[PDB]
Nucleic acid binder design. Structure first.
Length: 201
RNA sequence: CUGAUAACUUCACGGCGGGCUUGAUGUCCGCGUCUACCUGGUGAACUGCCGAGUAGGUAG
C-alpha cells in the first residue's frame, strides 16, 4: 500500500518493476491512475513517449497470455510439463491444517514459455483499484466499466479495437487442462477405503 | 501400492616478511575440647635315652 510515497522518493526506475511482479505487497492505483496504466502498457519490450505499443496487432500477443494464468504451477519442479490449472481449493479445512485455503488466492501468474514473459504485462498484474484486490484482465471484459475512458485518454485506440475487447475475453476462469500421457506429470495412488483406490497428482 | 518408476559432479594449486610490558608495595590483633569403659586358652601336646651342648640326635 505504497502508491505515491513509493512513486517518488527518488531512488531508481525498477522500484515499480519490483512492485507489480507478484512477490511483494500490492499497491492501490486510485489517485494517480493514468500515470500507472502508462507503465503496464510500456512493460512489454525490455511515459507517453515510447509509444506505437497501443493500437496495433500488439493486442494479438496481449490476448493470448490471459488463457495461461496458472493458479497452480504444473511446471514445478520439472521444466517440460504441459498444463493449465486454474481452480480454487474445492472445499474447506479444519483449524490445524495449513494449506492454500487458509490464505486468499490472488497471486496467479503466466507460465507458458520464454518469449511472452514481458508481453504478458498489462493484463496479468494486480493493482487494487478502489475496493477489490483485482487484476487488469478480469475487469476489462465488459462494457460498463470505469477507468476505460482513460484508455481513451490516449488518443490512439479506435472504437473498433474496443469491439474485440468486448467479446474476446468471455468465459475463461475455471478450466483444468492436463493430459496424463505423454506427459512428465507425477502421479500416485492411495486407498480411499478397503475396496478401491484413488489416483491423484 | 511411497511429489510414483530410472540416475557417477569432476580434473589442477607455496600466505608471507619485521618486533623490549614496564616502574612502586607491612595482613594483623584474641583463644581450656572433655567426662565413662572386662575381649572370654577350665584339665588340655605328657615321660625318658645318647651326646661336653640353649647345637644335634633317639624312644612309647
Amino acid at each position: 500500500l505504497k502508491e505515491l510515497i513509493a512513486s517518488n522518493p527518488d531512488d531508481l526506475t525498477t522500484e515499480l518493476k519490483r512492485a507489480f511482479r507478484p512477490l511483494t505487497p500490492h499497491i492501490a492505483i486510485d489517485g494517480n491512475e493514468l500515470d500507472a496504466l502508462t507503465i503496464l502498457v510500456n512493460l512489454t519490450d525490455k511515459a507517453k513517449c515510447k509509444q506505437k505499443l497501443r493500437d496495433e496487432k500488439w493486442w494479438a500477443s496481449c490476448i493470448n497470455c490471459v488463457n495461461y494464468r496458472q493458479s497452480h504451477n504444473p511446471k514445478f519442479p520439472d521444466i517440460r510439463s504441459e498444463g493449465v490449472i486454474r481452480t480454487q481449493a474445492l472445499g474447506e479445512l479444519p483449524s490445524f491444517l495449513l494449506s492454500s485455503s487458509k490464505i486468499p488466492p490472488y497471486h496467479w501468474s503466466y507460465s507458458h514459455d520464454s518469449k511472452y514473459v514481458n508481453k504478458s504485462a498489462f493484463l496479468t498484474n494486480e493493482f487494487c483499484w478502489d475496493g477489490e484486490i483485482s487484476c487488469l484482465g478480469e475487469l476489462l471484459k465488459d462494457a460498463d466499466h470505469p477507468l476505460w475512458n482513460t484508455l481513451k485518454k490516449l488518443g490512439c485506440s479506435q472504437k473498433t479495437c474496443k469491439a474485440m475487447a468486448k467479446q474476446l475475453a468471455d468465459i475463461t476462469l475455471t478450466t483444468i487442462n492436463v493430459t496424463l500421457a505423454p506427459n512428465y506429470l507425477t502421479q500416485i495412488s492411495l486407498p480411499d477405503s478397503d475396496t478401491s483406490y484413488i489416483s491423484l497428482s
